[PDB]
Amino acid sequence: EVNSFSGYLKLTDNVYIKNADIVEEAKKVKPTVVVNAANVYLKHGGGVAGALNKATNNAMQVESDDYIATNGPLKVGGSCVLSGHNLAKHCLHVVGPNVNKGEDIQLLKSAYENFNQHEVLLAPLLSAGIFGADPIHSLRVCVDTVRTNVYLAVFDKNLYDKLVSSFLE
Numbered sequence: 001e002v003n004s005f006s007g008y009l010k011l012t013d014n015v016y017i018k019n020a021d022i023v024e025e026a027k028k029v030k031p032t033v034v035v036n037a038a039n040v041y042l043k044h045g046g047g048v049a050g051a052l053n054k055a056t057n058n059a060m061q062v063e064s065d066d067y068i069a070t071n072g073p074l075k076v077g078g079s080c081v082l083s084g085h086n087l088a089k090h091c092l093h094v095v096g097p098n099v100n101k102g103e104d105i106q107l108l109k110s111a112y113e114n115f116n117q118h119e120v121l122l123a124p125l126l127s128a129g130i131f132g133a134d135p136i137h138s139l140r141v142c143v144d145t146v147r148t149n150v151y152l153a154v155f156d157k158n159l160y161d162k163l164v165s166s167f168l169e
């Protein structure tokens with residue numbers, strides 16, 4: 001079965017959300033696209049990026065290093081398409097702004113705009129966690145920007161409940 005997402009709550013006609021680990025979702029659903037919360041040099045050193053790379057037994061990092069050698073780094077708000085390995089057909093590496101490192105929160109709209117080149121995506125909440133953006137604001141930018149079908153996996157029941165309550169106000 002293709003893009004077999006289960007147990008999501010539909011927020012809008014094209015945005016769905018689940019309290020789930022994106023790694024486990026990717027292994028079970030086998031989506032056409034999984035989004036990585038990347039940095040500009042595609043160094044998957046921790047957080048969501050480190051977990052997705054570890055689930056590929058480091059194949060994503062080796063492929064990423066070869067992409068950067070030939071193409072140079074990404075820009076904040078930009079993306080590239082690489083292999084999905086065992087997690088998806090493709091991985092869309094998207095760089096959201098890291099507010100904790102002084103990058104502009106306005107680039108979060110440009111980051112979500114990359115999703116619109118793909119019909120269906122499994123994604124994390126961009127710039128949340130240690131990237132420092134307000135997660136309620138990241139969900140609002142996602143809903144306002146993405147026009148294709150996005151399935152957000154947020155691996156924290158406390159944050160999931162706060163996001164659904166924020167959306168339903």
Ligand SMILES: CNS(=O)(=O)c1cc2c(N[C@H](c3ccc4c(c3)S(=O)(=O)CCC4)C(C)C)ncnc2[nH]1
Nearest residue numbers: 021022037047048051125128129130131153155156
């Ligand atoms: C890394 N540990 S894990 O168990 O594999 C995992 C964490 C995680 C996860 N965590 C959320 C999250 C969302 C975005 C970003 C991060 C974190 S970050 O801190 O890695 C910086 C990059 C942007 C968190 C808010 C609840 N969301 C979805 N599947 C996940 N899987």
